[PDB]
Design a protein around this ligand. Structure first.
Ligand SMILES: CCOc1ncccc1-c1c(C(=O)O)[nH]c2c(C(C)C)cccc12
Ligand SMILES: [Zn+2]
Ligand SMILES: [Zn+2]
Length: 232
């Protein structure tokens, strides 16, 4: 009923959308992993009379449910998707997307890692993102590679028309007390990569983490603080 969705308010097997700004939504779904249940976020950005999707809904059935929710709530076709790193909360569902007519994209680094992991693999490679600080345009967004953080391949996404920064899993929500799933992380570089984001996007108004509640620019500093304390 208008608050940001959580596991407790998403019916089983479902997806919810949340309007962030004009022509910008997040998508929220839940998944089980290793016997625990987690929420995750992605992004939807209006691209004229089409939509750009950022990240899957963490699984094939969740991603089918995401497409249905988009049809119900927005009614414009999803024509392209970008996955922001190789984990299953970002690429799990890419095969569903690909069979629904969506063109799927990721950096070459993400594609290699996904393949090596046994995860679903986006079709198209995003060049121009291999060095930290690199940025490229993709429809209505900018894609930015901040350096290694949550993963070596993590990308962030900026929506310039709305000053929305989608941090993905490199950015944590303000209630977080730990650095989340750090299996593939670079704890030592992560603060430096966050500082690069802070420097590049000083006008961000909304910051969306890969998991949990959006907020403002303070999510960036909080993330650096939690990572440094996990490493300590
Ligand atoms: C282990 C604790 O993990 C987290 N705890 C809090 C929030 C997020 C996670 C988490 C993340 C992340 O931090 O991005 N990725 C996950 C995966 C990925 C690898 C699919 C699976 C399970 C959990 C997670
Ligand atoms: Zn991840
Ligand atoms: Zn994640």
């Amino acid at each position: 009923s208008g608050e940001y969705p959580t596991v407790n308010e998403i019916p089983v097997g479902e997806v919810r959308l949340y309007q962030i700004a004009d022509g910008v939504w997040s998508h929220i779904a839940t998944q089980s992993f290793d016997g625990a249940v987690y929420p995750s976020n992605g992004l939807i950005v209006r691209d004229g009379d089409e939509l750009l999707l950022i990240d899957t809904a963490w699984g094939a059935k969740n991603t089918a449910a995401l497409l249905a929710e988009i049809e119900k709530q927005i009614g414009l076709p999803v024509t392209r998707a970008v996955s922001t790193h190789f984990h299953d909360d970002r690429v799990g569902g890419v095969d569903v997307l690909r069979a629904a007519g969506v063109a799927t994209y990721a950096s070459p680094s993400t594609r290699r890692l996904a393949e090596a992991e046994g995860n679903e693999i986006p079709t198209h490679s995003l060049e121009g993102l291999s060095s930290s600080g690199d940025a490229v345009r993709f429809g209505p967004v900018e894609l930015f590679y901040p350096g290694a953080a949550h993963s070596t391949d993590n990308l962030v996404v900026y929506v310039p028309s709305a000053n929305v920064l989608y941090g993905g899993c490199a950015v944590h929500e303000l209630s977080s007390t730990s650095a989340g799933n750090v299996a593939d992380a670079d704890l030592a570089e992560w603060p430096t990569s966050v500082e690069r984001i802070q420097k590049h996007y000083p006008e961000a108004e909304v910051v969306i983490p890969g998991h949990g509640l959006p907020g403002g620019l303070d999510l960036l500093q909080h993330t650096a603080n939690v990572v440094k304390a996990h490493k300590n």
